[PDB]
Structure formats: C-alpha cells, structure tokens
Design a protein around this nucleic acid. Sequence first.
RNA 1: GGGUUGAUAUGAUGCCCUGACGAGUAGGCAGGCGUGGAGGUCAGUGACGAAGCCUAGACCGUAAGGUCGGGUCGAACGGCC
RNA 2: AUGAAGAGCUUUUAGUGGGCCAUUUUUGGUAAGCAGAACUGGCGAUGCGGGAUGAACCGAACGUAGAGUUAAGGUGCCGGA
RNA 3: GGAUGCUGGCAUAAUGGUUAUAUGCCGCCCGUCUUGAAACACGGACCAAGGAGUCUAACGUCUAUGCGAGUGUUUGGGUGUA
RNA 4: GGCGAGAGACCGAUAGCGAACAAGUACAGUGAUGGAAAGAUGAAAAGAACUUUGAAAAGAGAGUGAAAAAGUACGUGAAAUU
Lengths: 125, 148, 49, 58, 52, 185, 127, 52
Amino acid sequence: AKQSLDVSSDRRKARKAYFTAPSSQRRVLLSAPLSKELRAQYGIKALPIRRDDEVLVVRGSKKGQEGKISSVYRLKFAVQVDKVTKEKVNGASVPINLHPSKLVITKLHLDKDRKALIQRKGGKL
Amino acid sequence: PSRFTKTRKHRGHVSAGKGRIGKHRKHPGGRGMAGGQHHHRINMDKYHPGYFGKVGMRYFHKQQAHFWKPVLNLDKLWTLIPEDKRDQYLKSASKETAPVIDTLAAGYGKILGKGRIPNVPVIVKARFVSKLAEEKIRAAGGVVELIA
Amino acid sequence: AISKNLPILKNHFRKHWQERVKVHFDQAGKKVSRRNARATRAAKIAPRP
Amino acid sequence: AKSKNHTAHNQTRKAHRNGIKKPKTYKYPSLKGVDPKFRRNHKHALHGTAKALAAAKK
Amino acid sequence: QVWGSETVASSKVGYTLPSHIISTSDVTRIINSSEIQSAIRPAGQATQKRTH
Amino acid sequence: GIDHTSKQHKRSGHRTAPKSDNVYLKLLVKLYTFLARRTDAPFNKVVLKALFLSKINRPPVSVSRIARALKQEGAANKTVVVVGTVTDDARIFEFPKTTVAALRFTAGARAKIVKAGGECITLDQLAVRAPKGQNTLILRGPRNSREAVRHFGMGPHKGKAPRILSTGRKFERARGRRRSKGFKV
Amino acid sequence: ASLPHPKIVKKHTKKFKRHHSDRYHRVAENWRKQKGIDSVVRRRFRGNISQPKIGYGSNKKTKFLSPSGHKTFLVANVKDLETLTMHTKTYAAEIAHNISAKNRVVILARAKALGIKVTNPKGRLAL
Amino acid sequence: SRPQVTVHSLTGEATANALPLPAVFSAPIRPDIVHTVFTSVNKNKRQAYAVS
RNA sequence: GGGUUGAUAUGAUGCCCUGACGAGUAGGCAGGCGUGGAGGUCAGUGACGAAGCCUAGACCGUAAGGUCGGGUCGAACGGCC
RNA sequence: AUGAAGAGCUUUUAGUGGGCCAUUUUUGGUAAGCAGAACUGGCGAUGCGGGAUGAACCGAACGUAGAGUUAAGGUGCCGGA
RNA sequence: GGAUGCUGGCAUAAUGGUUAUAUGCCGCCCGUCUUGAAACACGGACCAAGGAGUCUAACGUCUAUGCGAGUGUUUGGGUGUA
RNA sequence: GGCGAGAGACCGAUAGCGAACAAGUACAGUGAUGGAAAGAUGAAAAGAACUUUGAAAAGAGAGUGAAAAAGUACGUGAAAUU
C-alpha cells in the first residue's frame, strides 16, 4: 500500500500519464518477461524489448506461437511480429499487434547496453 | 437533513404549503424590523416593549473589568474547600485552626447572605461583603478580613 | 417582517460577506506545518530550547 | 374598488368551536382593588390567628 | 488502566464509566423471580374467547 | 349520517411508549406495564407514565429536596422514588441514611448518599423490593423554574419576561416600561 | 400443496390509471393524484375514474398471496432456498431475473428434492 | 468476582494463564448513541465540495 | 378501551378481543414508494450475459411502485440496516 | 330535568384576513341577477338522488361490496314504476 | 357463543382475469387566479432531457442524547496507521 | 492569479469551467464587446477481395468479425412522428 506523498493513487492521473507517456517511458512500459530458460540463465525476471528479439506468445488466439520482433510500435503500445499475420481477402498480409506483457522471450538481441543493464539488475551472463 | 423534510412531502402539491391566495412573495411586510412605529407596532408594543427610546446616561469607554464583581453566597462557601478537609473542619468546628478562604483566588469579588452556613468559625478574605453575610459569619464565630 | 414573540436579532449580513468569508479548512495542515517548523528550527539551533 | 365593510357572520361558529368556557372561580380570590384599609387589617388579623392556632396545636 | 474500573481511576480526567439504570437485562428472570409472582394476580388465556 | 358531538379519530393526547430509543428504558417500561396490568397498583401506573415523560417533564430532584421530604412526619424510613435524575446540593451538610431509587444518579449525589450510609437503587431493584409501592414516596421536581416558562404567556400587565438576548440599559427599559416615555405597559 | 386459505377477493382487479394517461403521452399510467381545484376526478363526479383509497384494501388473510395460496419470496441461491425449506406450504420461490441458466438448473433440482414450489420454472430453457 | 478470561497462545490452543475482565465490558450497550455519534464522527472526515 | 412474558417457537414496536367512526380545497401531521452517491452486510447477481430498452404476456400491493417471463444488447449491478 | 361521546391547562406554527347565496328582519333606491347591515343555515372547500338543464334550492353528506326499506321527485312513452 | 350433510358434471380456457370491439346508462379539458370556469378568461401543437422553499450566521418552542451547579476536547498544544 | 504535488460522501458531455474534441475556436458586429455546437465502430481495420444489375451512387450475393441486430449516416438506440 501507499505510504508516501509524491505517489498518485488516481485513475485519472495514471491513465493520462500512460497515454501521454513519451517513447522512453513507453519502452519501459513495453518491457516483457523472460522465459524460464533465460530467467535462470541470466538471473533476471523481465526486461525492456526491441526490434530483433526472438519471442513466444502465450496468450491470445496466437497462443503458443514463436517469432522474431519486426517492429515496436510504441505509439500503439504494441509489437508487430513476423510469422504472426492476418491474411486479407485481397490476397494480402498484415502484421498483428500484440503486447509485451503477454509475450515471453526465447532469445535476445544483445549489445554493450543490454549487457550493462543486466549487470546492473544483478545478472550472471 | 433533506429527506426528513416537508419540502419532500410537498412535492406534487402545488403551492408548497404557502397558499394560493397569499402567494409566497418576497417581502410583503418590509425587511427587518421595519414598521415598528407603523404596521408592526402592535407586535413591538406587545412582545418587545421598551424598544423605542433612550433611558439613561451614556458611559463612554466602558470597561467590564472595572465592573468585575462576581458574587458568592454563604450557601456555598465550602465548595471552595475540598471534600478532603471539609468534614475534618466541620467536625473540628473549633478555634486556633480556623479554615481560611480566599474568594478572590477562587474567582469571586463579593460575598452575600443567601443563607444558613453551619455554626463553625471560618476566616473569609474578600474585597467586598454584605452586612448580613458578615453578621452571619461572626455569629457562627468566624470573621472577615478584607483585601485588594 | 416583524412577527410573533421572537427576540430582536442583529445579524450583520447586509454586505458582500460571501465575498469575504474565511473557512479554516486548513486547521489541520496548518497545525502540521507549525509542527514541522518547530522541529526544523530546533534542529537548526539543536542544543537550544 | 370598494369592498365589504363589516359583518358578524361566522363568528359565533368560531367561538363555539373553541368557545364560551366560563372563566373560572376559586377559593380565596384576589384582593386587587379592595380597600387597602381592610387589606392592612386583614393582614394583621391573619398573623394573629396563625400565631394563636400554632401556639394552640404546639 | 485506561477506561478504569470500580476500584482504580481511568487515567481520563474527570471520567467515570457510564452507569447502568437497570441492574440487568433478564426482565423475565425478574418477573418470574418469586415476589412479583407472589403479589401478582392470575392471568387469562392470552386469546380471549369470542363471545357474542 | 352522524351529527358528531366531538372530534372523530382524535388521539388521547397522552404519551404511550416513549420515543426514546433507549433499550434499557424500554425494558423498564415492559416491566412496569406488566406490573401495572396485574399488581392493581396506582404506583405502578404512575411510574409507567413518568417513564414515558420527556426530559423537561422529568426535571432533576435535589437531595436537599429529598431531605425535606424525609423531614416530613411518618416518612423517615420510607423509600424515595424519582423517575429522572438526582442531583447533588452542597447547600446542605447533613443527610440521613435512607435508600433512594431512580434512573440516574449524579456521581456527587451518589457519593453523598453512600457516605450518609444509604444505597442508590434502580427501578428494577425497586420492583423486586416493593412491587405495589410498599412504603414508597414519589418525588417530582420543579417545572416552572424554567427560563422558557419566563417568556411563556408574554403580554401587557402579566410580568412575563420578554424574549431577549442582550440585557441592560437601552435594551427594552424604555417606552412601554415607564410613564416618562409614553406609558408603562 | 398450499395451506387452507379463504376465498380471495381483490375488490379492484382493474388498474388505477392516471387521468389523461390515454389523452397525452407525456402523462403516464403511474397513478398520480389530481390536486387541482376544478378536477372532476378529485371531486368524484359520476362517470369519472375511481380514485384509490383504503377501502379497496385486501383481506389480511389473503394478502400478498398468489392464486396458489403461497407468498412469493425471491431467491438467488440454494441458501435463500434452504431458508424456505420448512415453509413450503406457505411460501414459494421466485428465482431472480439476473440469475444464470446453470444456477437456475441447480436451484430447480434442489427445490424438487426439497419439495418447494417455483413460479418461474422456465426461465432461460432451450429445447 | 469477574468470571475469568483464558489466554490463547500464538501456536493456537490455550494456556493456564488467565485474567479478569476489566469492567469496561460491563458497560451499557447503546446502539442509538453509537448511531448518532457514528453519524457525526463519520461526517468529520469530509472534504469540501462546491461549485464555481 | 382492554387482555396476554408462561413454560416449548419464531416476531411485545407482537398476537388477540370488543365497540365506534370514515365527506374535503387552503393548510398541518404521520406512515410509506422511488432516484444519485456514502459506511456496513448478503463469504449477494453476473460474459453460460450486468444495467438500460421493447412487450393490449403473467404475479403482488389501496397506491406510489415492485417482481417475473419473452425479445434486444453487451460490462457492470442490486436486496437489507 | 337531560346529556356528558372524558374535564381542565399550556406551548407552538401554518393558511386566512377579495367573499357569495337562500329563508326571515331590514336601509338607500323606480327597481335591479343593485348597494349596504342583522340571526341562522349553506356554497366556497361537496360529490350523491331529484329539480330536463344550473355552486347555493329540496332530500341527503361520501371507506369497498352485497341484500332490504325509504327520502325528495314521480309512475302514458322517451324512463324504472 | 357464525354451515353442514348428500349428489352430479368438468378437470379443461369451462369459470375467471387481461385486452379489443359491440350494446345499455353516465361522462364538457386539464392547470390557474377566482364568490363563481366547459367557458365567448389565461397557458398549453407534440416528445424527450433539464427545471423551482436550498446553504449559512444568530435565535424561539418542541423532542432525543450526554453530563449535571456545573457544562462546553477539537483557538491552541500533544500524538498519530495522518 | 503563477509553478509544482496530492486528495474528494463533488459533475459526469443539455451536468461540470464558456471550452473533456483543431474553444476564447468557428461565427456575428464598424467597434467596444458578444460567443456556440460537437465525445464513444470494433480487442484488432480484419473498413467489406471477388461475381452480378446499374451510366454511376448504390443494391443483391460473397466474405471479415464473437457479433454487420457493430458498416465511419458506426456502442446501446426510447419517445414524439412515420
């Protein structure tokens, strides 16, 4: 429960904060968990997400499905994934928006910065 | 509150308990104490007589601390003594140990005779007293001794 | 206006008192800020009374 | 714009709705208006009488 | 120590616990005790007989 | 039809079953109405009504009043009964040993009585000791001692205390109150 | 299954309708008293609607009863029903309107087992 | 002659240690008073609403 | 106006008996129906469909109004103090 | 004598403070469905039966039903007799 | 000091209710000020939604509650899960 | 008032600031000044491929969708009126 004063308990403020949150805050909100393998292998629960991570969907009608990220649409608060598409009656294809709260990772896309972030959050590599 | 209310019981009835002829209008008799020497004169002479006119002498810059003179009657005059020592003195209603009472320290300025203390001596300290009060005290065997 | 036996009343509300009302809703927060100030002053003059 | 001036209509009805009660009568009525001489002496006499009866049933 | 009792004071100044105006609540026990029942007259059958 | 010589469906004008929602008082009323119904006792009926009574028709009764009553003849070893409250009065210095029964007792009065060697009693204890009003004595306190009864009935030539907030010179001590300023009442 | 009741008289089966409920759509049938001054309904003229009053009230022994002779009592669950367990000959159950079909099925089976009557035993049945 | 009160442990069942009752529970029990006082004391946590 | 705490069982503001009476504007008082929100309780109903809306379909109440069924719809809502 | 349906007492507060009709008494006026008073009863504030019709007239005053008997008014038919 | 007995038929839309219509009799448009409104007095074409004795200061009677010759914690201070 | 924070027995799109939206906006007036209306598809546009009638708009099919009794004249969809 809340015990400070600089913390808002208002639906109104939290909602407009979330919706007018800019792209960096949106990254941190679009964080996603790790699978059991990577959680044990790196030492971390969850993480921000980006454009060439590999990932598994565990909620929805695309439940059970794997792929690699193709775009992170932060404006829409969503993630567009290759191999996860809708086939339009005009013989076409469309990517399907998802949420990184429901995604789960199988394999990352690493860099100096993600590695430093892990060593920051207390991981083992 | 608003739900225990005859407004809420008037709803539907037309004039809200004010009438159809008499027509609750704004100020048909005037405002305030208007017309006390006129169309409200009966009321002012029957219920509030003395209202019109001046009687006495003006006192500029008056002070109700010059006029501080609270009263105490002999009826009580032991309420100032606790119950812890009251019965002690009243049974040892004797001399050379007479209880002393500072009415002023208690919050009083004058002493009055509303009646019939016991026959025990007391010593009373006060700014003012009444003749009868003191006669009763020293008839009981006590005394008054004045102060500022 | 004058009516049945009721004491004469002197209610001085013939001006814009509802432009000038003060309602001390801040009784409490003002107490609390007085206390915080006392505490900070004491910590500023720490040994002193 | 004239009017009706006076009428005694309906007043008996109202009276007798809540009406004509006799005022009342007591033992020992008031001595207001009586000769003060008589009042004075009656006072002294009642004092004497009470004194006497009290001493008698003492 | 705080609300007091018969023998100690409460530590709230000028406070003595509120007093009962009735010694108990089993008014039925009172009614049926013995002495009421001695002074009481007998009773009807709780549902008067329809006559006429 | 009917040519009514009365008012129809009119209430008695008498309180039954008070609108105090105090459950203990209602218990007392259940008790004493049983007792009034069966013990053929006017005292029970009296107490029942006086329990229905309001706060101001239930004034206080000073222990000094009680003492006058016990200073009556043939009334010393009696049991005093007050439906209301009993107040202390330090305008007296002695007090007898009797027992007193009543709803409420100011702590000072209770102390005074207990110190004099009596006992302060509730009406249920009274109902077990003296159901028919054995050896009792009822007291009621003053009602016309009230600062609204001063103003009740205010008119000329009654001497009846106008309704007024502030007192003194220049508050209703003028026209109407002396023959110089027109007339005296 | 009910209890011996007397014969049921209602004294007005026809509904009390607001005056001009038929004439103006803004005036609805929910009964509402003409407080007017020249209202023949308030004046009880002949050939006008009958106003409600306490003489139309019902006999206490038949009041609140359905034709079955039962008093209706609303249930939302087996618990509210088990409350009615021992008063089947006087009280009957109305399953609420917001209940789901499966809970209705449950309640109906339980009421059958316990010998309790139900006055809406067809809500949300397909077939 | 307060009856007694048995103490329980943190591990459940009971103990031999026991207590009297503090004689506040012998106080009268008035829901009318509770109701009034509750209405007011629950009114007393309220912020001001108002219009422009 | 009365009767009835008596034990087992329920409701004492309850139950029961007897008698009389019932016009109504303004107006007064009382007992209630209903709406928005609040504290509490129903370990309340609910996407197997909440509320809302339609229903010369049913039921209760003198009535305000309440409940139910059928249809529509889609996310919250009621009973009691 | 008759009756008493309880007698007394207080507080407080609403609405009202335009009035009108009939019998009888009656004033001004040619008189008026005029104006102005008196006693009572009524309308207002009141439906019902009768008066074809009508605020007041006659009869009668009203909870919801049933049965019976009447009031005033009537019994050629409309319209029960 | 309040109706029981005997028998029959039906056991269903038969009774009954709702509803529409027909028939007989009655039935002037509501609200309003008004002595008096169906008025040849006013407002109203219709529907929805909004829409009018509230809040405060100081008071009177009355009724509940607490204490009681005293009463009032809550200007303020202390303390706090604020 | 300004800047920054927290809360509510407040209003819930005819309410609440005039303004929940490209509101001191459009718009009017010479000008001072005046001063609106207007929220909601759907979880996701998957916003209707293709065929056919028609000059076309649109229609009928098809199809998407849990639902077109959700088709940008989009939540539900009352009444007057039709």
